[PDB]
Enzyme design. Structure first.
Site, PDB file in Angstrom:
ATOM      1  N   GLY A 172      -5.187   8.348  -4.420  1.00  0.00           N
ATOM      2  CA  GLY A 172      -4.812   7.339  -5.438  1.00  0.00           C
ATOM      3  C   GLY A 172      -3.718   7.374  -6.538  1.00  0.00           C
ATOM      4  N   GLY A 175      -5.577  11.382  -8.327  1.00  0.00           N
ATOM      5  CA  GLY A 175      -6.488  11.670  -7.172  1.00  0.00           C
ATOM      6  C   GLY A 175      -6.880  11.054  -5.803  1.00  0.00           C
ATOM      7  N   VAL A 177      -9.260  10.666  -1.945  1.00  0.00           N
ATOM      8  CA  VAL A 177     -10.423  10.304  -1.307  1.00  0.00           C
ATOM      9  C   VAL A 177     -10.633  10.853   0.067  1.00  0.00           C
ATOM     10  CG1 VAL A 177     -11.253   8.274  -0.926  1.00  0.00           C
ATOM     11  CG2 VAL A 177      -9.627   7.773  -2.855  1.00  0.00           C
ATOM     12  N   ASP A 289      -4.680  -7.568  -9.239  1.00  0.00           N
ATOM     13  CA  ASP A 289      -3.879  -7.094  -8.853  1.00  0.00           C
ATOM     14  C   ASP A 289      -4.013  -6.840  -7.072  1.00  0.00           C
ATOM     15  OD1 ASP A 289      -1.846  -5.245  -9.096  1.00  0.00           O
ATOM     16  OD2 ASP A 289      -2.542  -2.981  -8.399  1.00  0.00           O
TER      17      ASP A 289
END
Length: 608
Positions: A172, A175, A177, A289
């Site tokens: 992301g 950070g 995943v 989005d």
């Protein structure tokens, strides 16, 4: 260590009142919770007489609703009629109102088979179960069990200790995943780690927090079109979103890998994306989005929507802000001051769909960083489209990308459903996609900074830990619920045998107008001795396991009951009348809050 453990059946009295306070002992609240239901039916089918049919009938009704074509349901309804209505009417063991029967009658003789049909019966099975039946569930051993689980539900804090982390799944903004297993059960979940440090650096604290709030507003009810949240927890520096495990990348990646998509292939994608939106819009949430790279794929080829960070709750306050990636935004978002709802998603959609057919965003005729040219193409133009599309796809896109709020699909009418009907989707049964019974076009192949951290930032992260009840329940029930029920049924029938011929402790709490009895620890200098307490409206007694209560702490000498924190646990502080002080430790958070209140009430009224 690893495996999940059930707290003993004596937990009862404490739990029962905890629940009662929150008014969670209604029929309803308990039938809805997945274990609540499951335990209720187990009590009905095995122990109560008049319950049997009512349940088996209900369960058969649920199966009927769940069926797909006209002809499987056609048959199913017949059997139901014969078995649970007709044959029961022969020996008049049918306890249902006139109007009810006659609904089902007038239908089955006409072969008409909506899934809603068995509704007016549904409601009267509730009816009969809500009153008396439920009360015998209350006193039953199966209620005892319910408490046991619900306890543990409520007592569930997490560290990385609770996860066996496997591989990395791609980053992301704040950070990475991962994919992992909950060693509790052994489900496969994903873990979105945000490192707090980073969030303080980029001023994305507004995002990080909002991502949380949204995720929780969505995940209730089951969806397969959204990355769904099952837990939320934090260690001093890491944020953690336990999320649905999604593997083979994002649509963006695969658009670059496969290339432009065939008409039929977009359809499939579209469908799912739509369903997803619908679900969001039904909780009053707008995604904003909608974009290729926010659509993830699982190994099997279906899809879900992903980053809620840039989404909003419009339940009371509709937004005016300009949030989204610049290619796919509705006129309403773009403008300074204009209030919008779901509408902006529907546009955003079109744009993305478009892109899947053509390679680019609809207004992006190659300007890299010049945002204003994508913004003015939006406002003066709804773009002209080639001859390679069907007249059917043509009207779906042309109706979506209307720069008016009023004239576009998904707005003035039914909302989510307006879209479902436009002739592009004529060749689909809409529940079929909801089951994911369609084939997917693409099966995906065989896959920093030294700043410190305040206390003022740390208190933005209490009221973040979260365990979305329902989700957890599900998890349990797919895997361990069943063999952990019968294992404890074995440990509890062995506990009753070790006491009888040795002379059972003629339970002395079930004889007095007592108030509650639960497990605690107390202190004397620094050991913790674990004892069993008994609370009457004027005294508090305790025994060890083999004796009859030798000691007491009375109500009138208690001066103030408070809570403290002894090495980062929560505990109870009881001030006494010589100056004396006394300390209590519980096991399970609720247990604690219930002593906290019931002591504070008993001493207020014993001093009256």
């Amino acid at each position: 260590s690893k495996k999940i453990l059930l707290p003993e059946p004596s937990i009862r009295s404490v739990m029962q009142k905890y629940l009662e306070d929150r008014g969670e002992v209604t029929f309803e609240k308990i039938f809805s919770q997945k274990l609540g239901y499951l335990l209720f039916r187990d009590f009905c089918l095995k122990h109560l007489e008049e319950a049997k049919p009512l349940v088996e009938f209900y369960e058969e009704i649920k199966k009927y609703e769940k069926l797909e074509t006209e002809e499987e349901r056609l048959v199913c309804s017949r059997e139901i009629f014969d078995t649970y209505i007709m044959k029961e009417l022969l020996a008049c063991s049918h306890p249902f109102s006139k109007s009810a029967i006659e609904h089902v009658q007038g239908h089955l003789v006409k072969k008409q088979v909506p899934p809603d049909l068995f509704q007016p019966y549904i409601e009267e099975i509730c009816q009969n179960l809500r009153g008396d039946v439920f009360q015998k569930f209350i006193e039953s051993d199966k209620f005892t069990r319910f408490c046991q689980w619900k306890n543990v539900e409520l007592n569930i804090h997490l560290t990385m200790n609770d996860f066996s982390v496997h591989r990395i799944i791609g980053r992301g903004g704040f950070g990475e995943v991962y994919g992992c297993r909950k060693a509790d059960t052994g489900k496969m979940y994903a873990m979105k780690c945000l490192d707090k440090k980073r969030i303080k650096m980029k001023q994305g604290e507004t995002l990080a927090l909002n991502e949380r709030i949204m995720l929780s507003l969505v995940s209730t009810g089951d969806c397969p079109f959204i990355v769904c949240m099952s837990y939320a927890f934090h260690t001093p520096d890491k944020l953690s979103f336990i999320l649905d495990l999604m593997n083979g990348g994002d649509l963006h990646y695969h658009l670059s890998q496969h290339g432009v998509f065939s008409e039929a292939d977009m359809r499939f994608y579209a469908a799912e994306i739509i369903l997803g939106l619908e679900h969001m819009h039904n909780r009053f949430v707008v995604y904003r989005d909608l974009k290729p790279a926010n659509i993830l794929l699982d190994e099997h080829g279906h899809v879900r929507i992903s980053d809620l960070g840039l989404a909003c709750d419009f339940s009371k306050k509709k937004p005016h802000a300009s949030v989204g990636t610049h290619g796919y935004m509705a006129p309403e978002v773009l403008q300074k001051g204009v209030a919008y709802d779901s509408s902006a998603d529907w546009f955003s959609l079109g744009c993305m769909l478009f892109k899947l057919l053509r390679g680019h965003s609809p207004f992006r005729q190659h300007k890299t960083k010049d945002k204003h040219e994508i913004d003015r193409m939006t406002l003066t133009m709804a773009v002209e489209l080639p001859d390679s599309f069907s007249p059917e796809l043509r009207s779906l896109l042309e109706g979506l990308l209307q720069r008016d709020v009023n004239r576009r699909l998904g707005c003035l009418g039914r909302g989510a459903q307006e879209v479902k009907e436009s002739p592009f989707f004529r060749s689909l049964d809409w529940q079929m996609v909801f089951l994911q019974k369609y084939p997917p076009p693409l099966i995906p192949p065989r896959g920093t900074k030294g700043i410190k951290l305040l206390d003022s930032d740390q208190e933005l992260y209490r009221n973040f830990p979260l365990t979305i009840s329902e989700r957890w329940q599900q998890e349990v029930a797919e895997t361990v619920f069943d063999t952990i029920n019968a294992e404890t049924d074995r440990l509890e029938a062995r506990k009753k045998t070790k006491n009888k011929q040795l002379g059972h402790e003629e339970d002395y709490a079930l004889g007095k107008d007592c108030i509650m009895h639960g497990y605690m620890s107390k202190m004397g200098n620094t050991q913790w001795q674990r004892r069993y307490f008994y609370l009457f409206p004027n005294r508090l007694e305790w025994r060890g396991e083999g004796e009859a209560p030798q000691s007491l702490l009375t109500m009138e000498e208690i001066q103030s009951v408070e809570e403290t924190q002894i090495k980062e646990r929560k505990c109870l502080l009881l001030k006494i009348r010589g100056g004396k002080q006394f300390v209590l430790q519980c096991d399970s958070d609720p247990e604690l809050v219930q002593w906290k209140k019931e002591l504070r009430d008993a001493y207020r009224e014993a001093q009256q």
